[PDB]
Design a protein around this ligand. Sequence first.
Ligand SMILES: Nc1ncnc2c1ncn2[C@@H]1O[C@H](COP(=O)(O)OP(=O)(O)O)[C@@H](O)[C@H]1O
Ligand SMILES: Nc1ncnc2c1ncn2[C@@H]1O[C@H](COP(=O)(O)OP(=O)(O)O)[C@@H](O)[C@H]1O
Ligand SMILES: Nc1ncnc2c1ncn2[C@@H]1O[C@H](COP(=O)(O)OP(=O)(O)O)[C@@H](O)[C@H]1O
Ligand SMILES: Nc1ncnc2c1ncn2[C@@H]1O[C@H](COP(=O)(O)OP(=O)(O)O)[C@@H](O)[C@H]1O
Ligand SMILES: Nc1ncnc2c1ncn2[C@@H]1O[C@H](COP(=O)(O)OP(=O)(O)O)[C@@H](O)[C@H]1O
Lengths: 375, 375, 375, 375, 375
Amino acid sequence: DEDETTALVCDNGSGLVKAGFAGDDAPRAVFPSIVGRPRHQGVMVGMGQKDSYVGDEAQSKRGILTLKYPIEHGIITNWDDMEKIWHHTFYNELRVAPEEHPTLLTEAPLNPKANREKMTQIMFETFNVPAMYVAIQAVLSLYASGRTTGIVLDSGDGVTHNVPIYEGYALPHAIMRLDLAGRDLTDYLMKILTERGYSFVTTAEREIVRDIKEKLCYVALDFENEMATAASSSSLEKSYELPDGQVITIGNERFRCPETLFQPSFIGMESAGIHETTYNSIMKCDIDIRKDLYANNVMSGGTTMYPGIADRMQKEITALAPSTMKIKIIAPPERKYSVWIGGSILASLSTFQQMWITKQEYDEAGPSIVHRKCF
Amino acid sequence: DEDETTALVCDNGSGLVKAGFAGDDAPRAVFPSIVGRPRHQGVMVGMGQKDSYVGDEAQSKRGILTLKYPIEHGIITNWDDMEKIWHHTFYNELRVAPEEHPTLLTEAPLNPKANREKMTQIMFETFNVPAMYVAIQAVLSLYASGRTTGIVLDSGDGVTHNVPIYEGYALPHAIMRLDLAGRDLTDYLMKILTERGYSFVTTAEREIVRDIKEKLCYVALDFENEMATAASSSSLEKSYELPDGQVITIGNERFRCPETLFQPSFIGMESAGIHETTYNSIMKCDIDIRKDLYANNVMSGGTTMYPGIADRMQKEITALAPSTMKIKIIAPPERKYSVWIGGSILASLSTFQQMWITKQEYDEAGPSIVHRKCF
Amino acid sequence: DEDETTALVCDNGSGLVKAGFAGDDAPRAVFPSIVGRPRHQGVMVGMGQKDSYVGDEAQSKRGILTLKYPIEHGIITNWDDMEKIWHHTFYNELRVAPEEHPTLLTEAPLNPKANREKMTQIMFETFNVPAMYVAIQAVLSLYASGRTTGIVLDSGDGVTHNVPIYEGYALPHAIMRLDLAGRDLTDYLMKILTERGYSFVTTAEREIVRDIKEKLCYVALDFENEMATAASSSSLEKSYELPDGQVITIGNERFRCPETLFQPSFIGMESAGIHETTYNSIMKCDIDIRKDLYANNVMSGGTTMYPGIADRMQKEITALAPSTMKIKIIAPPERKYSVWIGGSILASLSTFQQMWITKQEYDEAGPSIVHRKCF
Amino acid sequence: DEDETTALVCDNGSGLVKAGFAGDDAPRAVFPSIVGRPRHQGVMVGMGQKDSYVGDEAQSKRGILTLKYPIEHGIITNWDDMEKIWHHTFYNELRVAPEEHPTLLTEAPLNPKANREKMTQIMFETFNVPAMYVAIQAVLSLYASGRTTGIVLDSGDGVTHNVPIYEGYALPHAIMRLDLAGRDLTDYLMKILTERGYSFVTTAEREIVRDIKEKLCYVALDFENEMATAASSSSLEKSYELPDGQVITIGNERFRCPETLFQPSFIGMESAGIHETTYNSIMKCDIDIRKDLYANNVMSGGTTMYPGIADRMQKEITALAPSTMKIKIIAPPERKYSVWIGGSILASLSTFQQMWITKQEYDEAGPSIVHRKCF
Amino acid sequence: DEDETTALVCDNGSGLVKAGFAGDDAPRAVFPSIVGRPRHQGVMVGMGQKDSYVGDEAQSKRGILTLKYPIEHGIITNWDDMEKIWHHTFYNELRVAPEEHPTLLTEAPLNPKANREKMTQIMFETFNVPAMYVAIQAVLSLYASGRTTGIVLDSGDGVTHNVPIYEGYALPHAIMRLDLAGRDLTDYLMKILTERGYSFVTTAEREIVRDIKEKLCYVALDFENEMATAASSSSLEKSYELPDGQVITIGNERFRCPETLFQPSFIGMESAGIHETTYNSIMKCDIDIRKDLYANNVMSGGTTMYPGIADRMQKEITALAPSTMKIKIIAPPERKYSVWIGGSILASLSTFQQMWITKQEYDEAGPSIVHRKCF
Ligand SMILES: Nc1ncnc2c1ncn2[C@@H]1O[C@H](COP(=O)(O)OP(=O)(O)O)[C@@H](O)[C@H]1O
Ligand SMILES: Nc1ncnc2c1ncn2[C@@H]1O[C@H](COP(=O)(O)OP(=O)(O)O)[C@@H](O)[C@H]1O
Ligand SMILES: Nc1ncnc2c1ncn2[C@@H]1O[C@H](COP(=O)(O)OP(=O)(O)O)[C@@H](O)[C@H]1O
Ligand SMILES: Nc1ncnc2c1ncn2[C@@H]1O[C@H](COP(=O)(O)OP(=O)(O)O)[C@@H](O)[C@H]1O
Ligand SMILES: Nc1ncnc2c1ncn2[C@@H]1O[C@H](COP(=O)(O)OP(=O)(O)O)[C@@H](O)[C@H]1O
């Protein structure tokens, strides 16, 4: 609180907002992106509740609330709800006066121009920021990495991409999309557990299943052989206590759930699994740069956090590639916050501080400015 | 760095610049003559790239870049690009201060007067050389050889010539031209490999094919009989690993590609093959000097480097010449740098140091001087 | 069904089989070339479905099926699938007994010898044809045209060529290739529509987008000026009802999609647009025949069907050619079936009936016969 | 078509056949003497072309064809090709039945006896002429002129001669030969235009250059002074449109090309220029007849058609001859057909009709007859 | 190198210089008399050539050089060139210091007084000889012979004479001249070989033809009968390999060429053949000395070297002379050097050493002295 200034790095996630100050090593505020007020709301004797805050309160308030994601699949679809999320971010989580900070916002891949313009309009008109930037989330991640060359497999919450990069450039024609990512894997685990006679269907039960997924699932060494071991499997049958206190047993569901990344037909997806899309992406590049891609396969995103994933990707890529090809899979430790960190590096870039968009630019060429000939 | 001085010998090739110091046995700097910057250029997060350097970086940077040759067919056609190549030569490759060195430049056969004048203007005005010479590349080669008499077959990258020489003089009416040389053979190998179901069409793929040509092609003992052996040929089917790691098999393409020098109709050229042009050149000379030409057929240029070429030329010339004629084919070992070496000998000629062109001559009779009544 | 005989004209297209009887004015059978069976196949209560028929059933059966093209890029790559397509052609579409009809088959440019031999082997051994011919598809088209001289621009589904022709001969060195054609334009329209927030990614969605392309796209008068008019464009914003019944609006995507033929960099292609390849092809011919080429530029192929294409080509060629050059663009009305019609003319050529290949020739010199010294 | 008869006057030129009926004022048929069929011949879909007709078709068919002259340097060297030229002459150009017409044929200077005998054998055995004569082409020209005395400079297509004549007799020891004539000047113009960066090397390009030569070249008033005016020459820089439509500029090449007749060293010829050979020829005659030669210098042949040639020859001869010598240069208007006209006069000579050679003479003393003791 | 002294005998021939020391049996130095430097001279890379040496170098250097004879027809016409020939003679061929040797020079018949004076001036002023003599070449030959009486037929290179001699005196009125000799016969053989379709026109080709003449020509026994035998002549058709290696066949040209000495009308000469001039010379002498002439006909000169010439001259003279006349033809073996040998005898004549001309005589009565009242 003086001269200088930082850069409000707000990564608008499909399920979680990550926000903080440029220059910090990780976001200081992480809260669910949802909207929820009592679904039954039966009055009582007073009030003192906040209608649709969701954020952190919701979670801990599981069972009372309803949820909505105004950013459900990564694109913002409800501007009144999004204004509530940004107000919460600035005033309740970070506890800042937004008019004192240049703010860098992230946007999903393929975000419409008109959507970026509405984001810009709200920042300047509603929150009175002195400036702002919009950055592409994949791009920020790439930034955080620091690798000019290599092929990234980025699997997050709602989408997975394979992005080959040569000298810093995402050759746009190589990238392929997959709908599936963690949101789909949590829904599939709810369904397969419901196969055993359990019942996980409510909003609260979804949260419970997301926790089972993140704590007990793993990727097999070989799907077929893991299924065969399931028979005499005395390991798989882990126990998990529900908040009600009942204890369920989870066995082959531990590896059947994430097997979907390699076999999208488990959820009905025709798409090619992540090892096939990696190969298909490398084959859309020049033959010449393929050796550099094969030796620099970088994993990113929350859904690449499973133990065993790098070794499995090494095995599968080795099976598809030429016999003399050197293959290397890199996974950065704390991948998931790779998107926020790239934003932090960019926003905290004094040297490129002219890329931030300003109140004068917005007034001159409206918000589009932050879209036409920059970010 | 003292008195005396050397002579900047810069051989401006259609595909490669050869440059160094007069008196060295070979050029110290050899780099592709091209211009290229990112064809897709997708920004990123910083810079630190050099726009259109090409030189050596390009090659190793295959797939990102585009190429241009400002000297595509041997004549310089873009002076802003050529200034970049000469700046790279002096400051980045040789690491010299050009104002300290007389510089000998080479020029293609049939280079327009106005082109030699523009070369001269740039050397004096842009690089401030103390002097300079322009030399004819064929001539330099001839110089390097050291043979006063004989008929040279010089096949390089973009052109092939037959030059009969009697007492040091190129009888200008005997020389014949051929468009075809190595540039054409690389393009033809790309095309014939594409016949087998492979696809070699990009800039990067051209470089790959140039490597296959230089490592695996050869000239047959007899074209017709080699084609007949192709059937039960278990030798021809060599393997070559692409940078992508795939392995292709090359068979009759190994000798079909260079067969074009003897049969220009393979690429649609009406011209007479190199054995016919040799004979036609000797027959435009006096009958009397023909015995000296037949016994001194000297091969020069990169495209004469194929194993077997001297024996094939001996066989073909013997078949066309009178039965009692003594025929000898000479091939100098490291032919290709024959052009640079001749320049080095000339430029490093203290005794003929008055042939260098000077800043006073350029100022007096402009650059033309280095054209009218000298080189 | 008597003496005489016709000629089974089967044009094996990358996406569509065109087949019929020699002498008919157009093919009587046109069906998608694909292979597809239920991707989910969930049993039920009976059967009565045909595993991978594709043909016409598929289309109308959109959403259930998967697709494969055994001729994806014009070259046949799966012989068991191709045998199914030919069986369907003969027995289900034409309803003929193949052993009663000489059959002319078409093949893609650059089809390997061994591939033509396998086509021949199947016709004689599997279908017992009395004879057969293999014809080159471009050639058949040329045949259908009837023009000895002129430069053809042929843009079809998977490839576009510029072919200069003087007295009936395709000067092979003039022709240039382009990967792009209609298959690429449909993929690019799916991608650009997905930019607006729509989602066209499935096999069924590809078919939907191919229909939007064929019904609503057009080529601009000038790309730059059309983009500028897009702003106040109240015309462009056509509506299109999806099979789900939702209605999308299509605007600048109508002309951005086919702009790719003139600007291949829109899909990442370095290649030169079709006006540049036309000029480059004419410049590889003798100067003398150029006036005949400029006055006989013939358009062929499905991707040349856009309204406005001839006028745009006239404008662009006029801008590149000498000022006194007479330029004429010819487009034959029903171009697309130009390939089948040329086959029909050839196959129905009683006078050249000796070019058909026979069961005795195949038995004597195997199938190669239909390759070595004929078609 | 009745009694009487004319005389088939066929002048077998190195580049053009001139043929017609004795008594006509000029030949009715003039066509290139060449042989050419498709050099690439790529089949197609039919035929209807004539293999190696050349004649007129070739020219108009420039770029497809190859050429051969069976009479390249004036002497017939291929009898199967010559039979094709004579068949074309009789049946396609003149449309006559050769067995109805005595035919006079011309032959080059120094034609071997055996060659005249083979010409005679073909006329009688192949074409069944009733008679024939062979005439010496120079002689026919002399005949056409009508001058008994004077020195002729005859410059045609492949040769130039100086022939002093006193009372009708060519004093054989005075005549001198020069290789150079129009064929050489066209080749030299191709070469010098290629010096400016143009490229004229193909058969079609040779025809183009022959047209530039015949339409735009001229002989200078003084070579040295014309070169000096070239600097500020704003006239010379004429424009010429190529069939491709490009426009080239021609300047000093307009007079440098024909300067070769006066300076044969421009093409490497040691020979003395045409003014020196004229003087050298007059000095090999008696001193006494020199005054008659100096006052009757007659120009003949196509290469004497340049505007300015008579005035230049007057100037140069005046400079070499004694000061009191009366010098006169005569140039007949339509010189080039001077050879055919002399043949027409001779052949149409009823009074000397006994000089024609007959079928009985050929049968008696073979063809030689038309050689031994006549023509 | 001591007292005494020899006499520099330099025979200045029209084509060959013969020089040596008086008293030697034959000249030690024989070299072509010519002047020649590169006709094309195209620079190169150095020098080390001698501009117009000609001498021996020329010959062996055939094709590069030009020729000039400063003594073309026997009379010296260029004194700067002649000084070069004499310098070469003294310093390069004989390797003498001319100031140490009295030098005898030969001169052609009818050499002008002023020419002999200029020869004398050069010897004394340029070469500082101590003395010199000028001798008449015919005279020297006569001297070498040793016959006081008889009629000599002397046929050399540029002239042929018939000289009747009675008691040592050439009766000047009897002698007759002929232009023709070997120079003419070589030119005529070039022309007649060019009749068969060969082409011998250059300086190098002249040298080749001179060799064919000297190795294969001969004089017939009877011209008419030799021509008649030519038909079934299987002998005449000798082969001769050209330096280019081609092989020509020579037949009746072997005797047609030298037939010109007996029939000068073959080259257009009106003159009477050598047998007629012999008879005409004898008839201009007294009747009384004719018997001595008829019995002493001595042949001399290079052109009398043909085998068969003495027998033919015996036959022809017998046919013209009275029936009882004794006729004898003498031919000295090595006739050609008869001119040099006579000079050697004279110059080496101690007894007549007072006839040498001295530096004092030249200074007193200038050079004329060696002309007025001596030689
Ligand atoms: N340790 C982990 N193991 C497996 N999945 C994880 C882990 N940590 C986070 N995830 C999952 O990763 C997803 C969030 O990843 P993220 O890269 O932030 O996605 P996005 O950027 O698409 O919002 C959620 O589905 C979450 O459950
Ligand atoms: N060993 C080799 N075998 C065959 N071709 C070769 C070899 N080395 C070089 N070349 C070829 O020679 C050509 C370069 O020859 P060069 O004489 O330098 O040509 P230029 O002087 O016309 O630029 C290139 O086409 C190159 O591929
Ligand atoms: N009216 C049309 N307008 C634009 N494209 C068309 C039209 N009709 C057909 N096409 C396209 O033309 C292509 C098929 O053309 P065709 O010449 O048959 O190709 P190929 O021979 O390469 O299989 C398909 O991409 C199709 O969508
Ligand atoms: N008007 C002209 N000006 C200059 N050259 C001409 C002209 N007309 C014809 N020629 C040339 O004259 C030559 C033909 O002359 P011609 O006397 O017929 O030769 P030849 O008899 O040796 O065949 C050709 O080289 C042609 O280009
Ligand atoms: N063996 C020979 N047969 C025929 N001619 C010969 C022979 N030897 C020399 N000659 C010719 O004789 C001529 C030279 O004779 P020479 O008496 O020296 O002449 P000159 O004195 O007139 O110079 C040359 O033409 C040469 O070719």
